[PDB]
Design a protein around this nucleic acid. Structure first.
Ligand SMILES: [Mg+2]
Ligand SMILES: [Zn+2]
Ligand SMILES: [Zn+2]
Ligand SMILES: [Zn+2]
Lengths: 773, 133, 49, 264, 196, 180, 43, 160, 114, 65
RNA sequence: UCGAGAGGAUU
């Protein structure tokens, strides 16, 4: 386990880390001293012998150089001290141990590496100072701070070894994660706070600020955009100037609580063709998530275009925040005077509630709740009472927090903050918990020796009426010191079991490789899954998309989907198709509409059986919401002029398309039926969106635009297959182990111990239960 | 390449949406009845108080770089005191023989509904707005 | 400002760290678990000073 | 009087100067402040050889302290950078050599002031190398304290440089800077709790600008042209030659570009 | 680090010219970020920056002792008497341009502690260096010019990428590669090695 | 401290017995020290077992008789509503260790954050001894120009932190600047 | 140095949690992290 | 509980219902009562559900309890990762635990199991039972220091 | 240990010209100037002065890395107008402004009596 | 451990004011705040060089070698 | 080479 599974190796590194936005994402900062020390054997070629002989002439003392030279016989030549180090005639086939230079593949590491995206290749950018420089948006798949964290580095020694880093283990290749079927890297603290204040409509910038901001994009077409305001003084919006970073052909729609097409609160987001239309950019728009901006550009434009998109976004937003500034004082925690007067009034009303309940309990007038002791009902009542006052006063603070409150803005962009931190800092920190209970009596019938015995009031049981800003009392300080040690214990405890759990998961599933038939097997060859993931698709190229066959009334299902050819009121208007009047009552053609409708009804039965809860937003391998907007944009569509399609092109074309969405190429009946089983849900989406009414009325396609939609969907599906040879069990083990490490916090076994009991299958569970229907 | 729309409006509501330099204006069309608009306006440049009367126009001109005016040679095509540039992102259809258009002046949004603008306000990106005193 | 409180062994300032223990010669009552056949116990750690 | 920038001086001193700077671009006064801090040449110690040290402080402590000692650089333009000259190590045309000797003869503790530094190298008739003493007592500056029986003997080789190489070649320190004391330009968004006017203090320069009558709208054409400033000097260079050489050094910097452009 | 668990390394060293400044020309010795403040709730760090400001101007020692009836509002009443923002903010100008910053900066003295960790004492590097005799593997620790361990958890993760040929170089050519001769019938390391 | 009945319940020590201690503090005549306080019966030695049977007041103003306009910014302190007092704490700051007593305003702080500094405050560079030059220990690190803290605990005086500190009053600006 | 002369090692059923009796005798917050938190504590 | 169910028109609407929750389990004699639905009843004890409802019904009971752990912290993991873990425990026919004595009892060569908890006595029994090793495992060839069949190592390269 | 020598901020190194001229691709009348061993002290004064000239279209500088001292400047001008001629007259406009400032300041200095 | 020459933030020479500072505190019996304002220190960056400083060199020379 | 201890890492 310590010399064979893992071992110390040459060509290694270790330093401290630091974040530099002007470093690119796939770039890494390798200092010269470590770069002078590490080496890569490069055989001499006729192309590079002019460069290689020059590097020997520089010498190993100053970079770029070379530490050794190997001839044909293999007797090593030490260039640190040799009498013929000056004059060397490099014959072909000799080996040169040159220093590591710019734009070379190196493996960037971190401890602990319980994650596939914790071992990624990096481009070398040699830098003068001593730390390992890295981009800001690589903190997420490494879980790194810059407080004291160290990172390692390894160097390839062969050509195939160099290729596997650059083409498989690169940063852009691992942007989208199989775990969580979403990206990992995203825009972070200063960029995330800067992008919010920049994209506000009140925020405006003048020409002198624009031109510096404009040139800061590295690859940029050189055109200055026409300003939003031109008459009094030409002014550019933050939304105007940010659109230069986003490439042409990108579209994004997002809706939340208040989202009109006017958006008075400027919430929501609509992006069309790389120029954002309205909204305030924040964590939901750019933080690594399902259907994020990075999720779009990685799938549509590609990895490298999305990787450079991290650079251009940071350099613009940091430059605005450079010349605007942002801070945080203690006035960002001080609340209004009258707001504070309500807050302690709210606590006193809660404390009076605890007094009057206690007098009711003291007189044995309490009605015992079923299934619990009478004393347990007292704790359940009072704990829920005090948490109400804390949550009310905390939400009373966020009412009074003005828009310039620097703590609120970091939460408003979601950079580093939550609601509860505002409650503990300003209004009231609240109750402390020791092993799920209040502060117990270590002393005889009292919690602390400054209190009389048998005092169950919140002041004696661990309620901190004062807030962090207001000032903790000695009793409240000690009770907080009592509860805080449990969290430090639980953090040290949970990290111990988590690393054991990840070990047990990896060593159980290490042989799980998708063979060259999609039969998930192991060394003996025992089949676990006949199709990987029960469909055969890679988790990276997977997006959540609503299929609306499930939802809606049967009448609204009809009005959206019923094309009756032989009707006057349930037939498509001939303003929606060239052959509208010609195709009417066509008996050889109306059979195709009803046969289509018959499978759509059977599809609605099939999905409503499986998805009983009614949720339609589900992970599916090919996005069609984005693809139709591409066809709407690549080919310019007007709603006035009708299509140029026969209905028989549509229905026979979709029926032709399903036969070609291949997952398995056996000619046998069992594999072909399994192929029909594998694409059944995806075809259920495809028939719902490529319907005869929907194509010609909702997004009025043409014949040329429709054949491209068939061309894109087939290619995107075929690319979004699991590549055989992928180790997936080791990938599956880290996919559960990494979010388990973030697990730290009605009497049900939950969290990590519940996860421990499930894996280490328990004869005697701590909390078993029955859910009866 | 000339004027696409002209009307005179009386404002009804000015709404500072938790902002300092931007307000959401609400105005119907005088000389008509079934025509109103909702528009975002920078207040600091042009102060728009209540009960104002704003002559509003939309043109297609008067891509390529924006050079500064540099002279009277690049003569402005406006006796107004406000101008903006936007994109046509949505044309709503409220009912038959009625139409509403949506513009985005770089995040500042514009609502406009009416009847007779169904010969202009095409799907082209190019769109202006001009507001007189 | 050196407050003492340490031994000097082979030139190295060794410090005797405190050790923690439960008190001897005290009667203690410990409830036993469910699968234990015995139900209770009374323990005293008897040792001469 | 001449067309362009204007200057009116409110108050002045031997080491402080308070002036208004009218009719300039904002980038000029900022860039002037940067060269004034950084690129003005001034002489200070850069090499020290140590004969004997019995002090409680290590030598690199003292070598650090000797760097920060202010040395007069009024006539520094006739002195040459040691990088430029043709001497072997350092000569009288580039460097200035100093020597320091102190012995704990007295029973009581004996200090080592800056005035006890002595000069060895040839002056060649230029006002250089004199350690400045702004002390009213006349004793220069603390370098070390010596008990009876302690001794200290070393040499100090001064060299020419600028603050970009090390901060000991610092001509000035803590230069004030304020424009628009009423924020009529709206260059900053005031963070307030109840009222911005009552919570924020009035600047002292508010009396020398016209107050904004709030009935008038925002001036959406005025850019910054009047800048209030104060310059503080250590004493190595008087306050007039602090700013004037900084104007000259910046003027020399742009001229090097024009010289580099003509050769291209 | 400061006295409130706020760690942090030096990201870069800026000179006084590049640094922002206040109206009195005062420059910050140390620049930190607002984004490390709410996640850890170190309010005393934020008050120590405020209280040390009033202690410096008054010249009297600042009392940050616990369980003392001393209010921020009482402290901020004193700082208003000294002509500043009561809650600690200061108008700051960008040193790069001289343009004012819209957000006024929290400015004040804060006692900071230089930690015992330094980069040069931790920087490590190795290629073809010393080898232990027992394992034929590189020696342990940076003190003996050793190498870093390409551990099992790294071997676990690098399997998921599919870099098999990278793993062989990492497991043979990087360290402890060996060549041995085995009999075909007697499949064990047995053979007399008369190579020459 | 020892609390006992007088006309009413109050502390044994008085303001007159305080001045004999401070007279000994100034002269640095009969001297008055800690052993003189205990011998005279004005203090007691309490462990965990004996303090089970006692009732302790926190501040010595809790013996004042009760009886409006008040400052809102102060902490809300509960009226104890108990009168059978036996002892009073010296000052509640004393429960902190030697390392955590360095921490300024630990009441206004998360309890892990008080723990977090008190585990690396022992790592900070500083002058451990005045005879560092004379002594020859294997590793020694000394700050060039140490400064006493501008915010001092009352307990720092008995820990000699002002007379022998381990850090400087760096001027700190919290600014989103340079992206670093 | 001052905090290394006031330290208790405990060789080893809920010991690590801060106890009520620990008021006034052991430090509430001063304790190491990770390996043995709460077992080693300072007076 | 709150539950969505189809209206006769077709739209999903919230149909509340009462549901009992317990603190014990013997599912073999709980579903055989009157007044309940014996079709959709559920326990959080998956070990009895394997005994009562079959092995494959334990699969979804295993996954749902794992899914409830993940979404408790607000997290999200794709289905194929957990279903890989659930089926690996399930495919033996019993509830093969991921532990020292749950799956290391197997026929998966010899050297793959030596990388886990019981190291020497597994080799001793392998020395006793004379187990020929397949040498196709990841940990088999990593110990052997060879290019294991891991993606890039699965396919050989040949010349035409 | 690894830190570079402090004189690299203002001493030109080995064969490094002070100004390197390169024309920007996909733009008319565009050039980029790789200023060497300079900083914000020189960049802002040129850029603010180019904006005063109403025959200049584009003028902006950027420090590629605060580690090094090499800021880049790119200019775009009207047809038949090389940016060097726009650069030199604007640079000379600073020299007239600086020299006028020095002469105006020295008179106020001598008038002041302290 | 001995009075620094200049403030690290600004750079004004403060090393010369120490011999006056203690004598300003002793023979004049002045307040610390008025002592720093008298000696020309008006910004708080240079002000904390003298107030916060503890002159440890007096203890170092007490050791006879 | 071995055993022991004090830390640094995971918000
Ligand atoms: Mg960290
Ligand atoms: Zn010379
Ligand atoms: Zn044999
Ligand atoms: Zn200062």
């Amino acid at each position: 386990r310590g010399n064979l599974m893992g071992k110390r190796v040459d060509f290694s590194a270790r330093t401290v880390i630091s974040g530099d936005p002007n470093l690119e994402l796939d770039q890494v900062g390798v200092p010269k001293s470590i770069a002078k020390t590490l080496t890569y054997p490069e055989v001499v070629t006729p192309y590079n012998i002019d460069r290689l002989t020059q590097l020997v002439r520089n010498g190993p003392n100053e970079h770029p150089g070379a530490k050794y030279v190997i001839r044909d016989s293999g007797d090593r030549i030490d260039l640190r001290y040799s009498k013929r180090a000056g004059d060397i005639q490099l014959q072909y086939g000799w080996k040169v141990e040159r220093h590591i230079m710019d734009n070379d593949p190196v493996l960037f590491n971190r401890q602990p590496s319980l994650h596939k995206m914790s071992m990624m290749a990096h481009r070398v950018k040699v830098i003068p100072y001593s730390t390992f420089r890295l981009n800001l948006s690589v903190t997420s798949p490494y879980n790194a701070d810059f407080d004291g964290d160290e990172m390692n580095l390894h160097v390839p020694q062969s050509e195939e070894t160099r290729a596997e880093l650059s083409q498989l283990c690169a940063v852009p290749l691992q942007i989208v994660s199989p775990q969580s079927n979403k990206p990992c890297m995203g825009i972070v603290q200063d960029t995330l706070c800067g992008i919010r204040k920049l994209t506000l409509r009140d925020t405006f910038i003048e020409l002198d600020q624009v031109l510096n901001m404009l040139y800061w994009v590295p690859d940029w077409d050189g055109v200055i955009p026409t300003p939003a305001i031109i008459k009094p003084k030409p002014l550019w919006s933050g939304k105007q100037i940010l659109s230069v970073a986003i490439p042409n052909g990108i579209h994004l729609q997002r809706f939340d609580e208040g989202t009109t097409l006017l958006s008075p609160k400027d919430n929501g987001m609509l992006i069309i063709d790389g120029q954002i239309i309205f909204g305030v950019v924040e964590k939901k728009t750019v933080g690594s998530s399902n259907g994020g901006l990075i999720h779009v550009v990685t799938r549509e434009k590609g990895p490298q275009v999305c990787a450079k998109l991290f650079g251009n976004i940071q350099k613009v937003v940091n430059f605005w925040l450079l010349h605007n500034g942002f801070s945080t004082g203690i006035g960002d925690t001080i609340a209004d005077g009258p707001t504070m007067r309500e807050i302690t009034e709210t606590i006193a009303e809660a404390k009076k509630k605890v007094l009057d309940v206690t007098k009711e309990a003291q007189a044995n007038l309490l009605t015992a709740k079923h299934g619990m002791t009478l004393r347990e009902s007292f704790e359940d009542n009072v704990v829920r009472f005090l948490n109400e006052a804390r949550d009310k006063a905390g939400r009373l603070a966020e009412v009074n927090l003005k828009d310039l409150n620097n703590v609120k803005q970091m939460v408003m962009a979601g950079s580093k903050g939550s609601f509860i931190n505002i409650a503990q800092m300003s209004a009231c920190v609240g109750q402390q918990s020791v092993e799920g209970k209040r502060i117990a009596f270590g002393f005889v019938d009292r919690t602390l020796p400054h209190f009389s015995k048998d005092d169950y009031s919140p002041e004696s049981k661990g309620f901190v009426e004062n807030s962090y800003l207001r000032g903790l009392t000695p009793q409240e300080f000690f009770f907080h010191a009592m509860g805080g040690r449990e969290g430090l214990i639980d953090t040290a405890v949970k990290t111990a079991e988590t690393g054991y759990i990840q070990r047990r998961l990896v060593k159980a599933l290490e042989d799980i490789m998708v063979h060259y038939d999609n039969t998930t097997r192991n060394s003996l060859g025992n089949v676990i899954q006949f199709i990987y993931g029960e469909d055969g698709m890679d988790a990276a190229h997977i997006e959540k998309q609503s299929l609306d066959t499930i939802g809606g009334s049967d009448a609204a299902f009809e009005k959206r989907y019923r094309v009756d050819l032989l009707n006057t009121d349930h037939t498509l208007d001939p303003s929606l198709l060239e052959s509208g009047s010609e195709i009417l009552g066509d008996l050889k053609l109306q059979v195709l509409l009803d046969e289509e409708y018959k499978q759509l009804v059977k599809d609605r039965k099939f999905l409503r059986e499986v998805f009983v809860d009614g949720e339609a937003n589900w992970p599916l391998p090919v996005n069609i919401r984005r693809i139709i907007q591409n066809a709407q944009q690549t080919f310019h569509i007007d709603h006035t002029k009708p299509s140029d399609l026969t209905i028989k092109d549509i229905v026979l074309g979709v029926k032709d398309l399903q036969e070609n969405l291949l997952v398995l190429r056996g000619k046998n009946e069992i594999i072909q039926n399994a192929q029909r089983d594998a694409v059944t849900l995806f075809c259920c989406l495809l028939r719902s969106r490529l319907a005869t009414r929907r194509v010609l009325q909702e997004y009025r396609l043409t014949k040329q635009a429709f054949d491209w939609v068939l061309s894109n969907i087939e290619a995107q599906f075929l690319r979004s297959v699991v590549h055989p040879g992928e180790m997936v069990g080791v990938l599956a083990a880290q996919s559960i182990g990494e979010p388990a490490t973030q697990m730290t916090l009605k009497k049900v076994t939950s969290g990590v111990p519940r996860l421990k009991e499930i894996l280490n299958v328990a004869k005697n569970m701590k909390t078993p239960s029955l859910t009866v229907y | 390449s000339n004027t696409l729309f002209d009307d005179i409006f009386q404002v009804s509501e000015v709404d500072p949406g938790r902002y300092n330099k931007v307000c959401r204006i609400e105005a119907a069309s005088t000389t008509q009845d079934q025509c109103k608009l909702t528009l975002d306006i920078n207040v600091e440049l042009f102060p728009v108080a209540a009960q104002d009367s704003l002559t509003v126009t939309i043109a297609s001109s008067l891509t390529r770089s924006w050079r500064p005016p540099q002279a009277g040679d690049r003569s402005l095509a406006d006796d107004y005191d406000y101008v903006m540039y936007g994109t046509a992102y949505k044309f709503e259809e409220v009912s038959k023989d009625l139409i509403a258009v949506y513009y985005s002046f770089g995040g500042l949004l514009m609502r406009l509904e009416g009847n007779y603008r169904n010969l202009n306000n095409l799907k082209q990106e190019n769109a202006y707005l001009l507001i007189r005193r | 400002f050196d407050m003492g409180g340490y031994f000097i062994i082979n030139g190295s300032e060794k410090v005797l760290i405190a050790q923690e223990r439960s008190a001897g010669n005290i009667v203690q009552v410990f409830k036993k678990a469910a699968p234990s056949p015995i139900s209770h116990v009374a323990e005293i750690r008897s040792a001469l000073e | 009087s001449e067309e362009g920038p204007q200057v009116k001086i409110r108050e002045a001193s031997k080491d402080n100067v308070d002036f208004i700077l009218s009719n300039v671009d904002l980038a000029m006064a900022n860039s002037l402040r940067r060269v004034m801090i950084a690129e003005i040449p001034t002489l200070a110690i850069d090499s020290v050889e140590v004969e004997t040290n019995t002090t409680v402080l290590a030598d690199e402590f003292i070598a650090h302290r000797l760097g920060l000692i202010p040395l007069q650089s009024m006539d520094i333009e006739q002195l040459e950078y040691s990088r430029d000259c043709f001497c072997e190590d350092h000569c009288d045309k580039c460097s200035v050599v100093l020597t320091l000797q102190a012995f704990g003869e007295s029973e009581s503790t004996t200090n080592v002031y800056s005035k006890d530094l002595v000069i060895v190298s040839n002056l060649m008739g230029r006002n250089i190398g004199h350690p400045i003493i702004q002390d009213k007592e006349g004793n220069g500056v603390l370098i070390c304290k010596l008990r009876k029986g302690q001794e200290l003997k070393l040499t100090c080789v001064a060299k020419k440089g600028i603050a970009k190489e090390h901060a000991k070649w610092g001509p000035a320190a803590a230069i004030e800077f304020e424009y628009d004391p009423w924020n009529k330009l709206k260059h900053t968004d005031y963070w307030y709790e109840q009222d911005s006017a009552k919570e924020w203090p009035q600047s002292k320069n508010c009396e020398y600008e016209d107050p904004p009558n709030e009935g008038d709208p925002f001036d959406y054409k005025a850019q910054a042209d009047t800048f209030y400033m104060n310059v503080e000097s250590v004493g190595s260079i008087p306050v007039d030659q602090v700013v004037v050489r900084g104007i000259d050094t910046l003027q020399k910097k742009v001229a090097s570009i024009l010289l580099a452009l003509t050769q291209m | 680090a400061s006295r409130h668990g706020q760690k942090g390394t030096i990201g870069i060293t800026y000179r006084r010219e590049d640094m922002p400044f206040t109206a009195e020309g005062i420059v910050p010795d140390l620049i930190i970020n607002p984004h490390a403040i709410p996640s850890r709730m170190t309010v005393a760090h934020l008050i120590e920056c405020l209280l040390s400001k009033v202690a410096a101007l008054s010249g009297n020692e600042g009392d940050a002792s616990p369980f003392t009836d001393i209010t921020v509002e009482g402290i901020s009443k004193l700082l208003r008497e000294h002509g500043y923002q009561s809650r600690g903010f200061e108008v700051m100008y960008n040193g790069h341009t001289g343009k004012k910053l819209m957000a006024q900066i929290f400015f004040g003295p804060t006692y900071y502690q230089r930690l015992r960790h330094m980069v040069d004492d931790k920087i490590h590097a190795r290629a073809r260096g010393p080898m232990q005799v027992l394992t034929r593997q590189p020696v342990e620790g940076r003190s003996r010019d050793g190498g870093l361990r390409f551990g099992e958890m790294e071997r676990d993760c690098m399997i998921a990428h599919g870099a098999a040929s990278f793993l062989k170089e990492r497991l043979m050519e990087a360290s402890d590669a060996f060549r041995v001769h085995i009999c075909g019938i007697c499949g064990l390391m047995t053979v007399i090695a008369k190579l020459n | 401290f020892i609390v006992e009945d007088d006309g009413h319940k109050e502390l044994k020590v008085r303001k007159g017995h305080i001045a004999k201690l401070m007279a000994t503090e100034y002269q640095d005549v009969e001297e008055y020290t800690w052993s003189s306080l205990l011998n005279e019966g004005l203090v007691e030695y309490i462990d965990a077992e004996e303090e089970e049977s006692i009732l302790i007041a926190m501040q010595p103003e809790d013996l004042e008789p009760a009886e409006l306009d008040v400052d809102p910014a102060k902490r809300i302190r509960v009226s104890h509503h108990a009168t059978t007092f036996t002892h009073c704490e010296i000052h509640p700051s004393m429960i902190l260790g030697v390392a955590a007593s360095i921490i300024p305003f630990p009441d206004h702080n998360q309890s892990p954050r008080n723990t977090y500094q008190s585990a690396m405050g022992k790592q900070a560079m500083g002058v451990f001894l005045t005879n560092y030059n004379v002594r020859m220990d294997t590793m020694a690190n000394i700050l060039y120009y140490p400064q006493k803290p501008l915010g001092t605990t009352r307990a720092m005086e008995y820990l000699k932190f002002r007379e022998l500190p381990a850090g400087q009053n760096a001027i700190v600006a919290i600014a989103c600047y340079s992206g670093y | 140095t001052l905090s290394h002369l006031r330290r208790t090692n405990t060789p080893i059923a809920k010991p690590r949690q801060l106890h009520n009796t620990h008021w006034g005798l052991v430090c509430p917050a001063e304790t190491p992290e990770g390996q043995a938190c709460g077992l080693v504590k300072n007076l | 509980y709150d539950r969505k169910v189809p209206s006769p028109t077709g739209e999903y609407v919230k149909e509340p219902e009462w549901v009992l929750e317990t603190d014990g389990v013997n599912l073999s004699e709980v579903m055989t009562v009157p007044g309940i639905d014996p079709t959709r009843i559920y326990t959080n004890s998956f070990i009895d559900i394997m005994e009562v409802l079959g092995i494959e019904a334990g699969r979804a009971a295993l996954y749902k309890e794992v899914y409830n752990v993940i979404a408790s912290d607000g997290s999200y993991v794709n289905y194929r990762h957990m279903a890989l873990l659930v089926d690996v425990m399930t495919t033996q026919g019993g509830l093969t635990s991921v532990t020292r004595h749950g799956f290391n009892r197997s026929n998966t060569g010899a050297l793959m199991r030596c990388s886990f908890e019981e190291t020497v006595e597994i080799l001793f029994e392998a020395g006793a039972s004379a187990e020929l090793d397949d040498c196709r495992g990841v940990s088999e060839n990593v110990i052997l220091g060879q290019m294991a069949p891991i993606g890039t190592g699965a396919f050989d390269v040949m010349i035409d | 240990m690894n830190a570079p020598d402090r004189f690299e901020l203002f001493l030109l190194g080995e064969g490094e010209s002070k100004l390197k001229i390169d024309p920007d691709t996909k733009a008319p009348n565009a050039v980029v100037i790789t200023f060497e061993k300079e900083d914000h002290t020189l960049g802002n004064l040129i850029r603010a002065e180019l904006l005063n000239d109403r025959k200049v279209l584009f003028a902006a500088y950027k420090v590629e890395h605060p580690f090094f001292a090499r800021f880049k400047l790119r200019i775009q001008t009207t047809e038949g107008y090389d940016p060097k001629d726009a650069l030199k007259n604007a640079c000379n406009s600073i020299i007239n402004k600086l020299g006028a400032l020095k002469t105006n300041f020295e008179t106020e200095w001598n008038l002041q009596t302290l | 451990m001995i009075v620094p020459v200049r403030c690290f933030s600004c750079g004004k020479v403060v090393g010369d004011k120490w011999e006056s500072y203690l004598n300003l505190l002793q023979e004049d019996e002045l307040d610390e705040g008025t002592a720093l304002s008298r000696l020309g220190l008006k910004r708080y960056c240079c002000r904390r060089m003298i107030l916060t400083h503890v002159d440890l060199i007096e203890k170092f020379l007490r050791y006879n070698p």
